[PDB]
Amino acid sequence: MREVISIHVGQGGIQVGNACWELFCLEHGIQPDGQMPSDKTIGGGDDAFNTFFSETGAGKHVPRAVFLDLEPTVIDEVRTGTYRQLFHPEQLISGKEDAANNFARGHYTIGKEIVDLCLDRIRKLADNCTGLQGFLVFNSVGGGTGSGLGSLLLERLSVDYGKKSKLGFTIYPSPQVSTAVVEPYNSILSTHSLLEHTDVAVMLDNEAIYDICRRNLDIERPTYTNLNRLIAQVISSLTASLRFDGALNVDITEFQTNLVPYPRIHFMLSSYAPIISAEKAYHEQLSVAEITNSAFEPANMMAKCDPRHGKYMACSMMYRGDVVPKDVNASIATIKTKRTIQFVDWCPTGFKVGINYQPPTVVPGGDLAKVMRAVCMISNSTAIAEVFSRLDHKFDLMYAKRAFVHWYVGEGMEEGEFSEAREDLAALEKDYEEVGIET
Amino acid sequence: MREVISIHVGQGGIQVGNACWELFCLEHGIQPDGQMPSDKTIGGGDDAFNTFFSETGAGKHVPRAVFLDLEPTVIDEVRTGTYRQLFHPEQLISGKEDAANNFARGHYTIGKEIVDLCLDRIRKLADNCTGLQGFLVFNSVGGGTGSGLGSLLLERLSVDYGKKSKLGFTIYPSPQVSTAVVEPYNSILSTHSLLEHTDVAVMLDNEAIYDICRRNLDIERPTYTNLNRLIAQVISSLTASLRFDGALNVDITEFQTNLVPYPRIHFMLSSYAPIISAEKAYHEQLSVAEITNSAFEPANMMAKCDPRHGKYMACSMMYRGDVVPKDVNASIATIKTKRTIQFVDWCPTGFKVGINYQPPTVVPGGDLAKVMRAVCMISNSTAIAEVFSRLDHKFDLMYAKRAFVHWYVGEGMEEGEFSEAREDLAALEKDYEEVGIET
Amino acid sequence: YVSPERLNDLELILYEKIRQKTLPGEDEGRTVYRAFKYFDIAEKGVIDISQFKAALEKFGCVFDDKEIHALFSKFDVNRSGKICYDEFCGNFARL
Amino acid sequence: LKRSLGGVNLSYANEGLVKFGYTVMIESDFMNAVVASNIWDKITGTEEAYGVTVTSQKEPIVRTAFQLLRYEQDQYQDDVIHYGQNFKIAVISRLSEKPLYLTSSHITPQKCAKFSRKQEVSISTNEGINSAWCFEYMDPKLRYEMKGQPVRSGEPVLIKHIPTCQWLATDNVQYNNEFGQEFEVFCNSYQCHNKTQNLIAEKVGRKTIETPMRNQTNQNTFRIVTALYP
Amino acid sequence: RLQYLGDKKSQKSAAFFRDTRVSSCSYISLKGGVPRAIPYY
Amino acid sequence: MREIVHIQGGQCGNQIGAKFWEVISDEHGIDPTGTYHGDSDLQLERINVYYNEATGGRYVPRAILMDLEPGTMDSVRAGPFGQLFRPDNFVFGQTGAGNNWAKGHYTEGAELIDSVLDVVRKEAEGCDCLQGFQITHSLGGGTGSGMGTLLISKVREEYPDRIMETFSVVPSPKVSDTVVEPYNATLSVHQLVENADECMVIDNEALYDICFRTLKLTTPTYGDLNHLVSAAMSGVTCCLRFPGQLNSDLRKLAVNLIPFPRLHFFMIGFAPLTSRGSQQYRALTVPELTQQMFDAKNMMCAADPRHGRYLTASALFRGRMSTKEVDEQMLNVQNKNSSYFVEWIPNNIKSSICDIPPKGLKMAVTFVGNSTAIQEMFKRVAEQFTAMFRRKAFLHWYTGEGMDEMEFTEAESNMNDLVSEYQQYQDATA
Ligand SMILES: Nc1nc2c(ncn2[C@@H]2O[C@H](COP(=O)(O)OP(=O)(O)OP(=O)(O)O)[C@@H](O)[C@H]2O)c(=O)[nH]1
Ligand SMILES: Nc1nc2c(ncn2[C@@H]2O[C@H](COP(=O)(O)OP(=O)(O)OP(=O)(O)O)[C@@H](O)[C@H]2O)c(=O)[nH]1
Ligand SMILES: Nc1nc2c(ncn2[C@@H]2O[C@H](COP(=O)(O)OP(=O)(O)O)[C@@H](O)[C@H]2O)c(=O)[nH]1
Ligand SMILES: [Mg+2]
Numbered sequence A, B: 001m002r003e004v005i006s007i008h009v010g011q012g013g014i015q016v017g018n019a020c021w022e023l024f025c026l027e028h029g030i031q032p033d034g035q036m037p038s039d040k041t042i043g044g045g046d047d048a049f050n051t052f053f054s055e056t057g058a059g060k061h062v063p064r065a066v067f068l069d070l071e072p073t074v075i076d077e078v079r080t081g082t083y084r085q086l087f088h089p090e091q092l093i094s095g096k097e098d099a100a101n102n103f104a105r106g107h108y109t110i111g112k113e114i115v116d117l118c119l120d121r122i123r124k125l126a127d128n129c130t131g132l133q134g135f136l137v138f139n140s141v142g143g144g145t146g147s148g149l150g151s152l153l154l155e156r157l158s159v160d161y162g163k164k165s166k167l168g169f170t171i172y173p174s175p176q177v178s179t180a181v182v183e184p185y186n187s188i189l190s191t192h193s194l195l196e197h198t199d200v201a202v203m204l205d206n207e208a209i210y211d212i213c214r215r216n217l218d219i220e221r222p223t224y225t226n227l228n229r230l231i232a233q234v235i236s237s238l239t240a241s242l243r244f245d246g247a248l249n250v251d252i253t254e255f256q257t258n259l260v261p262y263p264r265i266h267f268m269l270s271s272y273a274p275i276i277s278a279e280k281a282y283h284e285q286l287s288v289a290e291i292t293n294s295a296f297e298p299a300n301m302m303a304k305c306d307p308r309h310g311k312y313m314a315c316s317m318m319y320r321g322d323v324v325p326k327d328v329n330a331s332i333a334t335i336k337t338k339r340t341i342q343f344v345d346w347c348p349t350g351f352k353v354g355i356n357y358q359p360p361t362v363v364p365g366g367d368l369a370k371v372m373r374a375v376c377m378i379s380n381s382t383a384i385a386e387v388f389s390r391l392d393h394k395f396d397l398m399y400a401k402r403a404f405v406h407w408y409v410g411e412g413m414e415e416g417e418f419s420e421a422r423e424d425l426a427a428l429e430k431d432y433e434e435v436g437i438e439t
Numbered sequence C: 001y002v003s004p005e006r007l008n009d010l011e012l013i014l015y016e017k018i019r020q021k022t023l024p025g026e027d028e029g030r031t032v033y034r035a036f037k038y039f040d041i042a043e044k045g046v047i048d049i050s051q052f053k054a055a056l057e058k059f060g061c062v063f064d065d066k067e068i069h070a071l072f073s074k075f076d077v078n079r080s081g082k083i084c085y086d087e088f089c090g091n092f093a094r095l
Numbered sequence D: 001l002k003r004s005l006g007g008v009n010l011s012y013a014n015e016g017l018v019k020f021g022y023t024v025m026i027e028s029d030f031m032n033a034v035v036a037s038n039i040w041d042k043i044t045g046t047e048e049a050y051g052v053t054v055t056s057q058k059e060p061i062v063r064t065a066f067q068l069l070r071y072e073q074d075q076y077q078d079d080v081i082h083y084g085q086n087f088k089i090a091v092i093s094r095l096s097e098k099p100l101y102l103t104s105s106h107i108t109p110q111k112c113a114k115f116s117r118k119q120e121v122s123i124s125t126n127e128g129i130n131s132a133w134c135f136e137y138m139d140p141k142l143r144y145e146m147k148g149q150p151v152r153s154g155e156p157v158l159i160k161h162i163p164t165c166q167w168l169a170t171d172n173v174q175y176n177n178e179f180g181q182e183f184e185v186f187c188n189s190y191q192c193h194n195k196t197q198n199l200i201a202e203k204v205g206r207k208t209i210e211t212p213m214r215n216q217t218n219q220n221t222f223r224i225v226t227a228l229y230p
Numbered sequence E: 001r002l003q004y005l006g007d008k009k010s011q012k013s014a015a016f017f018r019d020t021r022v023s024s025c026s027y028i029s030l031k032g033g034v035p036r037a038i039p040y041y
Numbered sequence F: 001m002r003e004i005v006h007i008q009g010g011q012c013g014n015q016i017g018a019k020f021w022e023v024i025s026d027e028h029g030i031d032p033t034g035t036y037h038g039d040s041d042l043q044l045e046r047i048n049v050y051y052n053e054a055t056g057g058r059y060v061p062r063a064i065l066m067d068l069e070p071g072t073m074d075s076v077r078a079g080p081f082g083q084l085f086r087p088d089n090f091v092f093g094q095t096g097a098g099n100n101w102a103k104g105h106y107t108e109g110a111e112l113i114d115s116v117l118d119v120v121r122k123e124a125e126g127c128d129c130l131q132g133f134q135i136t137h138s139l140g141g142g143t144g145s146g147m148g149t150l151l152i153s154k155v156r157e158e159y160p161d162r163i164m165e166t167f168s169v170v171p172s173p174k175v176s177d178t179v180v181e182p183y184n185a186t187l188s189v190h191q192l193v194e195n196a197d198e199c200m201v202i203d204n205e206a207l208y209d210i211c212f213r214t215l216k217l218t219t220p221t222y223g224d225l226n227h228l229v230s231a232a233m234s235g236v237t238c239c240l241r242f243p244g245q246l247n248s249d250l251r252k253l254a255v256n257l258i259p260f261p262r263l264h265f266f267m268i269g270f271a272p273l274t275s276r277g278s279q280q281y282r283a284l285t286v287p288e289l290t291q292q293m294f295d296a297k298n299m300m301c302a303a304d305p306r307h308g309r310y311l312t313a314s315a316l317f318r319g320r321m322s323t324k325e326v327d328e329q330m331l332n333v334q335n336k337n338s339s340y341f342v343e344w345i346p347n348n349i350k351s352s353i354c355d356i357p358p359k360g361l362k363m364a365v366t367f368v369g370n371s372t373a374i375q376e377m378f379k380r381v382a383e384q385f386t387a388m389f390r391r392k393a394f395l396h397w398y399t400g401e402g403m404d405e406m407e408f409t410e411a412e413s414n415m416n417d418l419v420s421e422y423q424q425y426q427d428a429t430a
């Protein structure tokens, strides 16, 4: 009865969306054929597939997903891929022309000819759902289609539904390992759209994953398959509590009231641990003692921002496996004892605790083997100001004398809008500086 | 003891009757040759086919319909087709020469020598029947023989019978896609002929039917055959209440009151749902709540007029399948609560719910898959104003210079008929506006 | 039974069904081939009678088991029981 | 499992003339299963009645064996069972200590099937009207001139409740209990929904109410079967 | 008493919604030519 | 001995009838075949009330099924329990009603009244001393309200002394099953006031609210709604068939339930109700029975008895209970619920005792009470006509039977003041 509708738009999301579902598929025992034979279980068990799947009355399960992109290239591979018989035949929206990495195209001219289908699909989707708890949307910010259609879609929801909480996982350009040349433009204007419209944002920069993959997995030539695997874990990591028995269940509704002190400060960064491959794992111990300790290692963070460069504002952790809760308290206490990690003055209690028994599931053929414990660290800190600053520094140099501006201007977007972006992006930064001051 | 005699005239009438009779025969299980398998004659005395079939006494089952047409092409096809042995070899009357899209020709010159046989044949057919409930007439308005013999037959039946209820399933011209160029004339004149001599009529325009197939069934290159099949579905849905037991039953007499507050202008707009193909069928819930909602969407409407333009007078729901009656009442509540459809101020309660148990039957070679529920749409609103005016405007535009008129004048039609009929069209373009609007 | 031209007639209606379902700019053979490639999962290139029946039902051509077996045997000359849709789609394209 | 799976031997059938006393099985012809009983699980009934389950496995077990003891003294003192001669379902003495009888009660908003939502069939110890049953030939036309006729083992058998006139049949509905997975058992009339104008039949008099004019589908099909060997 | 009843005089007034087949209540006021229709028992 | 008769008409009126005989057949220990197999010798002593003696030792109900459409009566006899009714007693034509109150009272229904009046008179003459008629039908339907009422109207001209009942399912505005639902009921309603001695109003909304809320059922079917209404029927005559400490025939209730000669519209309720998953977890005894029965929501009328004050009320406790406990709970309910057993008639609750509990339950009660709270139903339900009358029409489907305007403007003149009769007897005080 507790269900969440997933929204995926853009090339960046689609593959990460591809990764999340497979593991989601694996965790329930629903093979790509669309069935859940299990140990010949027919009615002799609980009803836990509600959280991410819906019953059709006799047989298969239809995922609660809607897919959006303007280039049929990405959709086609999924439609003819290894999961061709699972997704709804028509809920896989396919476009006609590529967004060509331009925001103006993806937000004012070509993106307005497909939203109608998206909302129609979602409205019907919400109808089936009875215990809607929120929304999870995966999108990319460095692409015209990504920011554009995603921003427009999110805006539409804001008025259509309103108070329904939103949690979105975006992918900002890496600090230095970056591909697109006009990506910063789309990002900032994307930030304005989601700045005052989304509730919880989880930074998921790409470069950080590479080091996590290389250093710990000890892989020197990772591919896009590997990075997607990690993200699916966290996505499955954060929401797995709602659907399995746990000592202290935590609902997606219990993040806006426990992690965002102020309405505008709602940008947060993630990290994951433990990370161990299938070769050097069984000879290591993996105790709650150090697993928590490693989670706070700056080099292990899932984003390229040094937590040592700012105070800590609010934290939230979830435990899994056979963790004895008292073990949870012991790990936290010493962390406070350590002086390297420091909190702000106005947050007396800054640790939210939750324990879910189920062990993380392993998809064969991957990198992470079967461990008996793990922890997901999701914390909001004032240090994230730098990343917004660094993007701002890039914008100023490439906007001082109208770089590639005419491409965006001609599509209809007003020139003065960019002045609006600079005002909002810098305004948020100046907001963050004041927050960290001491009383 | 209850029967309905179906009368068909014209090309469209003949084809629609063909498809509908195929559907009826398959649904009642009578084999094409007209001989039931010798294992299910237990109820042969009463059974249900008495509504459409009259046992010969030795086994053969005669449809209670008559086919009329002035062009031997279609009539010949029926005899040479696979249904050759079913229809009576005299009740498919054959004409001699075509009317050729001249409503004047088919009403005073070429039809006088044949209308006599139709009256005798219909009287003979009705004599065997005991509990005549009503007459159904399908005709093509824009067709010469259709409107002409269609109009003359209705006018004659008026005096011949009197109070017998009778429904008119006409096929008016499409708004923009056209088959004949003189359709505005033969359309307009037929309107007056039917207005005060038919009690109930339902629009069955083409384009609305065409789009419905394209949007749902996913057949980008549909032929007329796909069109006729749905019409047969609508007929079966409308008449199933008379031949299948149910908690709530609606008879043909249950319509002249529950939806006809007035005698003169008798018109309707209908819709159907669901229309789901196999590739998109098993993957969806097909719930009663959702199906009804899909019914009121203007996109699925079966006539080229958006119902949102005005006010709904009354609407009759006929369900067939495994609908739980408690669900029906709840569904109507959501329809009333939605603010996108506003009832014409007077409607106090214009819903008539019909519940039948027998599920719809699937015919080989069709597009519909197998479903366990359905909903029928028959409701008229001021939205039927667009259909009449749009036909009229063409009438004035093409009559302003006496074009195509001479084809009519020299065939016997006086000049005053056109002048008088258009006055009725004015009497219909100043009807549905008095309550379309604090008086 | 179903020895006489009734099998040929069933093909005529079937060819019409794919023709109606065929997308613009592509022949019916591609439309039938794509459906076969959708249903099959082994990727070897051979499907059983159940897969063939599932493909027919998707196209809307649903018939009794006897007719389905006759149609399969008509194009399954080798009698192995694993028809090759590569030739089956090609025949439709030629027709 | 041990007791329930205790050895059971179905009695032989001579000349296909099933007679009261021969420990016989009850199969679902359409559901391809044998009626199985349970003593452990308790239904939500103040009295002592126990649920029933139809099982696909056809290996013979005691819990799937019943007894056909003459329900009432009648004119038919000869032992061959006759259509419409009252008889009762009796459980094997091995399953439970107290004699157990299968029974059903009428429709009720409070008393309804757990899954099928129809009138439930109860294995209780009541000793009233609720025990009777009477066979009826499968062929609808022959329903009249079968009265008093012999019943032959191996011929399809339908079941109807004399206190209520409802057929005991099985439908494709799952059920949960210890003994693996199983389907449910309940009484109902899956009459062909098509109506027959019986009213005019009487006044015109062409036909009488006795001969039924409504087809009865297969899902009600049951066929009594005896043991393989004597 | 109190209770309800019907209306039953149709071919009377409004000259247009007269005998317009469409469950349209009784007829159309049009005294002012504006909005509310007649608000079966 | 003081037996009664039943005349149920219309598809709605028929379906309720289809179960009551199902319900009655059980109480007297009778199965479908028409043979006796009961358990208790008291089961059979008072059997003559509802059946007539017949050859072969078989019994047949004293029922007349009346309809104008062929499907309904064709429907019932082919279903379970299809053998009880006498084939001769059936009556039907070849036209139908079509929820047109006009056609059901002047043209078609009028012409066939001969047979139904023919059959009804004969059966009543047979009984030793006719107790009275109970008429069940749906005023929202055509044949029931339209033609069914006339039979109610006509029968008064022949049997002035016997008393009447009406289990009329008046439709509610919340969910209407017909657009005509609000030109057939009242026109049958208006004629109902001058002839109907008593009236039971059962609102559909109450049934669905009753089924979903307390029973905790998920997907009920009309079979669920029908029986609950039928159960109420057994309560009215329950004490008329079995001995008891305090008996009260249908006459005795009539005396103590209608404060004034014409105010004869009641609301009823049935207790106790509990879900399948809840039976064990409840201790059933006398004092918690009152909590359910007196609860407003338990009422089968859409009206809320908290909108007004109770005039008179009666309750027939079912199940073997002593005499002391029955009275005392009345004293507290009267005092505690004094605000409603308004104030000018002391102790307006009647008491009955019977010693035959419904099979499978050890305590249940039946409720028949009069409270002004019925005023809302005759105020709101279809109240739109007062505004929707002004525009004169829909006529062409009803003057087709010769009905004129004067037949309508007169009714409120006769009908204006029911509440204006009920309202006045709600504020008055000594
Ligand atoms: N980590 C990761 N990032 C991706 C992936 N796919 C796309 N991206 C991001 O997308 C950015 C470039 O955008 P595109 O490749 O054009 O994808 P898009 O956002 O959908 O834009 P369009 O091509 O117009 O659809 C890169 O900078 C990546 O950061 C992916 O599979 N993994
Ligand atoms: N939807 C649909 N419309 C049809 C069909 N057959 C004919 N029509 C209608 O008929 C029109 C063509 O003229 P017809 O009415 O068929 O001509 P006719 O009825 O044969 O009269 P004559 O040609 O004079 O003999 C088209 O515009 C269609 O709207 C059909 O099978 N389906
Ligand atoms: N509670 C209940 N109401 C019913 C039943 N059958 C019909 N109705 C009601 O009767 C109304 C329709 O009555 P109608 O068909 O016009 O009566 P008829 O003209 O005699 O057939 C619907 O609004 C239903 O609510 C039933 O079995 N139980
Ligand atoms: Mg892209």
Ligand SMILES: [Mg+2]
Pocket (backbone or CB within 6 Å): B010, B011, B071, B098, B143, B145
């Ligand atoms: Mg023609």
